[PDB]
Design a protein around this ligand. Sequence first.
Ligand SMILES: CC(C)[C@H]1CC[C@H](C(=O)N[C@H](Cc2ccccc2)C(=O)O)CC1
Length: 558
Amino acid sequence: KSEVAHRFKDLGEENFKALVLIAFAQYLQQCPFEDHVKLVNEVTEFAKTCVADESAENCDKSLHTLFGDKLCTVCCAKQEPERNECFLQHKDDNPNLPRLVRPEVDVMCTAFHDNEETFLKKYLYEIARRHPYFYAPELLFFAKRYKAAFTECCQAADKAACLLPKLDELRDEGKASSAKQRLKCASLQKFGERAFKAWAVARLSQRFPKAEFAEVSKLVTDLTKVHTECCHGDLLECADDRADLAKYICENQDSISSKLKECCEKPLLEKSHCIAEVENDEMPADLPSLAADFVESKDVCKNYAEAKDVFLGMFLYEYARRHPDYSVVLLLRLAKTYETTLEKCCAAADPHECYAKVFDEFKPLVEEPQNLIKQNCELFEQLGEYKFQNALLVRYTKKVPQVSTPTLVEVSRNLGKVGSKCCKHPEAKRMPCAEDYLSVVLNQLCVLHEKTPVSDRVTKCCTESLVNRRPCFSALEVDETYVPKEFNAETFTFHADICTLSEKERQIKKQTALVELVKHKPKATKEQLKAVMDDFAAFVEKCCKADDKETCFAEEGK
Ligand SMILES: CC(C)[C@H]1CC[C@H](C(=O)N[C@H](Cc2ccccc2)C(=O)O)CC1
C-alpha cells in the first residue's frame, strides 16, 4: 500500500502537483515560490516511481512523513504524529505578507503567453499563503476560471475591459469561500465532529428535502470525512474523497434531488462546485407533523435510549426538511432544546406528560433572529452600505475597544456586506442568509482575535457554544473599564499617497481613523464624531486637488 501512488492514480498528475503545492504553501507560508516548486517536482517524480512499483523504497511511507520530511529540508521534532500538529497550529490567518499588486493587463497577458504554467502556478501559491485554510479542491476550480479569464480576454481587443471585471468577481468569490471554509474548520477543531455533523444534517436536509434520512446520513458522514481531511492538511485525501462523493450524488440523483441534472454534466471541478451551490429542492408534498413521531408516540424514549444522537439527528433532519426559511443556527437551537427536554423527561415516571408541550418552547426562539434582521435591514436602507459600516464602527468599538483597529474595521465592513447581500431578499430568504452569513463574519473576528487575545469578553464569546455565538455578542454593551489612549499625532496625519489610492482603499483609511478617534475619546457624542470625520473628509480632497498636494496636508497639523 503506497499512499503516494494511490492518490497519484486517482487524481492524476495535474491535480497532484497542484494539491501538493497548496499544502506546502499553507504549511510554510513564508517560504519563497521557487523553493516549493522544487519540492513539489521531486515529490511528483517520487510518486511516479511508486505507481510503477509499489514495493520500491520509501513508497510505503505515509503522506505526512513524505511531506513533512520534504518540507523540513529547508518544530520538526522527530515524531511525525506531533510534527504534523506543529504545522497546523502555526498556520497564520494574518501572515503579514506584502499585499499583492495587480500589474497592467498587457504585463499579465504577456506573462500568460510566455510561461503559462509558472504564471498560474504562482497564482495558487500566493493565494494558499494568505488563506492557509482554503478549501483545496475549491481552489483548483478557481484556478481554472482564472485561466479561462486570461485565455479569452488576452485575445480580445480591449483586454482591460474584459479581464478586470472577471478578475474582480473572482477575487470576491474567493474571499467568501475562504471565510465559509474557515468556519467549517473551526467547528471541527474547537467543537468536534458532532457539532459539524449536526450542521451538515441541517444544511443538507434543507437542500435535499426529498432524500431519506439514510441518504442524508451517508452524505453527511462522507462530507465530514472530506472536510476533516481538508482542515487537517490531508489535501490529497480530501480532493479524492470529494470527487468520489460527487460521483455518488450523480449516480443516485433521483434519490437526492432534482436540481442536479445540469450539475452532473459539467467537468469534474465544476461538478463539485455546482452541487455545493445548488438551490434547495422542493419539499415533498403532504409531510406529517413532527408531533406524531417525536411527542405523541409512546416509543419516543425507547428509540432515543438506543442511539440518542441518531434519534436527535432524525429530529433535526425532519425539522430541517420542513423549514428552508430557518437558519442552520436556529435549527440547531430547536434541536438542542428538544434534547434537553428528552434528557429531563425520559427519566420521569410519565415522560409523555413531561415533553407534551416541548414544541411550544420553540416559538420564542424563532422570533429572536426575525427581529434582528428586520430591525437592522430597515436601518441599512436609511443609511446605505458606507454609512451603515461607520455606525457599526463607533458602536462596536465602544463595546470592545481592546480589539485592534484593523480587526474592528474588517468585521464592521463585512457586516455592511450582509446588508448588501441579504436585506434585498424577502422575509423568507432573509433568515438563512443573514444569520448564517453573520456566523462567518463573527468567526473572522474570533480567529483574528485568537492570534492576540486582548479582550477576555470576546474570548469567552468564541470559546463557548458557537451556536450561541451571535446572542453572546449582542449583549456586550460599552466597556467602561477601558481608559482612553493618549493622542497620537501620526495616526491623524495623512500622506500624499492618499491621492493614488482607489476610492475603496481611501475609504478604509477614513474608517480606520474613525476607530482611532473613538479609542481616543470613548465618550464622544454622535454629532461631534461626524463633524471631525467630515472635516478631514474635506481636507482629503481639497489638499489633493491643489498643485502643492503634500504642502497643505502639513498645514492641517492642528
Ligand atoms: C443583516 C445585517 C444587516 C446584519 C448587520 C449587523 C447586525 C448586528 O447587530 N450584529 C452583531 C454582531 C457583532 C457583535 C459585536 C461586535 C461586532 C459584531 C450582533 O448583535 O450579533 C446583524 C444583522
